[PDB]
Ligand binder design. Sequence first.
Ligand SMILES: [Mg+2]
Lengths: 49, 210, 230, 231, 248, 76, 49
Amino acid sequence: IKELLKLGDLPTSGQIRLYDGRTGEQFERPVTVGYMYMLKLNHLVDDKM
Amino acid sequence: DMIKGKQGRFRQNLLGKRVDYSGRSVITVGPYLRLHQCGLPKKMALELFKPFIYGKLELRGLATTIKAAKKMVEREEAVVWDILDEVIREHPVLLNRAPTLHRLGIQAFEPVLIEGKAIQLHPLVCAAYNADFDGDQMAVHVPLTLEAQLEARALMMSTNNILSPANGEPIIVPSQDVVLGLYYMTRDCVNAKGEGMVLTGPKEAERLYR
Amino acid sequence: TEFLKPRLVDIEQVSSTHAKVTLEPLERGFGHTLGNALRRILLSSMPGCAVTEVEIDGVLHEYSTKEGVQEDILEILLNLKGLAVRVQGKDEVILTLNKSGIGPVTAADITHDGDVEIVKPQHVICHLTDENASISMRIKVQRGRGYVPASTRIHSEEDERPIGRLLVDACYSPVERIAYNVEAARVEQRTDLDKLVIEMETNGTIDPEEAIRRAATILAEQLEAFVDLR
Amino acid sequence: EFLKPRLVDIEQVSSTHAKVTLEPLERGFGHTLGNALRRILLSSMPGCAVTEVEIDGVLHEYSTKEGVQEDILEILLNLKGLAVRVQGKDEVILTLNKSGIGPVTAADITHDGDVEIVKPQHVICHLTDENASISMRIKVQRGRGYVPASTRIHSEEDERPIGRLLVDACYSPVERIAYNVEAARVEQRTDLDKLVIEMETNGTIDPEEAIRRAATILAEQLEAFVDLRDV
Amino acid sequence: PLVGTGMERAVAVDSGVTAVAKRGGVVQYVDASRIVIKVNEDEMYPGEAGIDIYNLTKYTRSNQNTCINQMPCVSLGEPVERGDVLADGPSTDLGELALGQNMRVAFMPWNGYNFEDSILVSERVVQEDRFTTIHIQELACVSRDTKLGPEEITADIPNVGEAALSKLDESGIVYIGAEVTGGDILVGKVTPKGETQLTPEEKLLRAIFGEKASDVKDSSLRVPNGVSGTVIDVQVFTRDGVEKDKRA
Amino acid sequence: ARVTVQDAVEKIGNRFDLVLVAARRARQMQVGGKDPLVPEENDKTTVIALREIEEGLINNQILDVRERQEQQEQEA
Amino acid sequence: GINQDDRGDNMIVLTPSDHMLVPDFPGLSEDGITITFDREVALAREDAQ
Ligand SMILES: [Mg+2]
């Protein structure tokens, strides 16, 4: 994983510096970001409500 | 068989009835709420409080008869939403979660009309409900009579129930995010920026931090 | 196209230095943009006057002691930091305090100069004990923008100064505290609109409203160069 | 005794990507202005987009035409991306008519004066039959923000023609905004900063006009704020 | 999936949801309803071979009310081999299982809106229309034979406004493509009325006015409360019928 | 809104007949036989009755005296 | 004892009831009759009494 991150020219540690979209100020202690494969289950609120 | 047994009688139809003016939906966080309030979707609130709406509409004279009040509710004009906001003002509603283990399974809150189809629940009370936001649902009842209103606001209101009936200790303690934030806030470090400077008060401390 | 502009600017001024200000009609998302912009501009860049340096006739270092004052020197510095003075014409002026006798030496006992007004004549400075009760000092006040910590000036102090030149943090901006809450507000059909409640504490001199006034004025002055569709 | 920011060189690297610089920014106002502009740009830029479509041989969104391989829904998805500039009118009706085998791109639209098709290479469909023919009339409106079909359904206003196919309107041209405040050594100053706004758009709004309009809106609202009655 | 395990193709192929070539050849015709392939000479039957045609199935209702739609993968003139994926079944791409979608997440607490296991989502996700699903309800109107007389499907329905008839054809079935809402009359049915025993003068009045003694009651199906969608398909099943109905 | 009823229960420690006296007051208020003794701020009659109880103006005995006075008044 | 359904647009539908006071009323029928009290509505709706 470290090698693959390096090949893309990204920090090997997997954490990036991020800016708060509302205020614009930086967050201390960089955070883990990245893409995850998510699913939407069959429990839809309009059926439940 | 009809008399005896669960499916038959006493348990089902004489201790396990099915009330009116009741609803159900999924629970959601809603951090901005006050401890004594709860987010309630507009459309369910309108449906529940329908007869109150009709009464107030007829009292204000906006509608001659009850059918005109119904038509005015089915068009949904701004006046209807204003009357709904005004009537909802101090009327409290009862919130219940399916396994009512102890008396804190039913509590009263003041509703605030919101968009969406999800009920917004104050975070601090989740521990009391043993509630989790993973598809758990809750039911919502409306007290009608004046004595019911007084009972809900006096005996059942969230702020009146802070101590557990089992032991005297507080029930509403901060759970996970709150304590993490406070912990981060209070811990000190040997060396940083602004070590050992003297401040005249908290206000300039905040000036410095921001 | 045509936007929605705020009306009904209500202001609950409890304790004149402390003002709550409510703005119910605002468009989606502008709550945080305006609150944060206002807060930062108010806090970091505001022209004011403040005490910068002091010379004590008796003590050479901030940890030495004067006989008969129970308060330490650092406490005197902290008390002097709170002095809110407004000079009109002059840029930098040097006030003298000389007091004797028992009791609290307060701001009123300072020598009355022309351009400088002390908004709080009853602000305590020092406490003098019996039978010696000798306090004399010269405090230099300067005009500037924003907040300047001691550390940044003391860094560049290669220009050797006589002993006793005690630097103090300059609190120029008149705002002591500023905060803004954003909350839900609906115009009868549109719910995704918000109310801005701005709580502001100033240091007596100017009332919060006019502070806000010149803040918005300054920001508009910077923006003026681009806006031309009129 | 103040400074004030002047708009300086505006580099254009591509048709969509642009860099705008503001040199003489006072200390501390860099981040404030950067963030304010980012917000205004991302939120409030007015643009035009297709609102509804009528194709001939199709009753509803879910049917299928002979001689095409995409579903109708994918046709709507392709139409959502069309970047167009309307000058004078508020509602324009474009007409697309193509026959024969080939990819029906946006270029085949009948060229009207007031409408500018920014990306003519944008694909719409692929025909697969010599005698297969598609005709459609696309209605394009101007607006701000994001309005879906289902909300506007309350205000139907005679949606009566069953041939009508409503599309969600993304009335917003700006895709991405970044800014950097960096030290602007001015010949008579120690610590000054320059703000650099890097912007990526769908190629409809020009940078200068975007920045001007944003500044206009912010200045107008600030003007509204300046007076305080206290009466 | 950006992060899979490799088993996706096995699962997708082995399920019957994809359309897979049985005899390899060349794609002769591509449409969003059928794929027509010219067989290769190797696998080509000597006697009475012809070509292979695969008709696809478009939106029908599954047991769970989800949509079942197949898309073609291949294009005109592409060569296909036995066991390749021609058409994508539900939630599969080019032979691979694509159950959901892959998005950029950041792990952090954002003003307690993700307090508990709850999730925060950006408006860009709904704007880009990437989590919108299609569902499908089925409704059935049954006309039986009572002993007082068979009910009728005619469009003449007592004391209904012409608004309700507007969307019905002469046969009494909704138009394909019509947008409906809760409470609208899905189909027209009439309940027979018996022993009217009208007076002769009353019978004459009925004759001139046209009032029907046989009717006076409606068994017409209505859209369930609070459900609104587009009629995509209609089917008619007639046990006896003298002749096929127009819609039939 | 009355977020806490602590002063009303501190006025009458039973916490139950509090509800009864407040119900009597709010019932004299709703069916417009009576008038509020406190300037209302667009509150409903429940919170009005609690606000009256918490200020010490109304209890059961004041209810009894006012009712018997009204009885003897209408008796003549 | 005549049920009066208020359709809303100045038109009342009268239908008899189980508690009507006469075996049969001369003008009434079980299917009901629509009426309007406004002369202009009557001039626009000849199906009403
Ligand atoms: Mg759960």
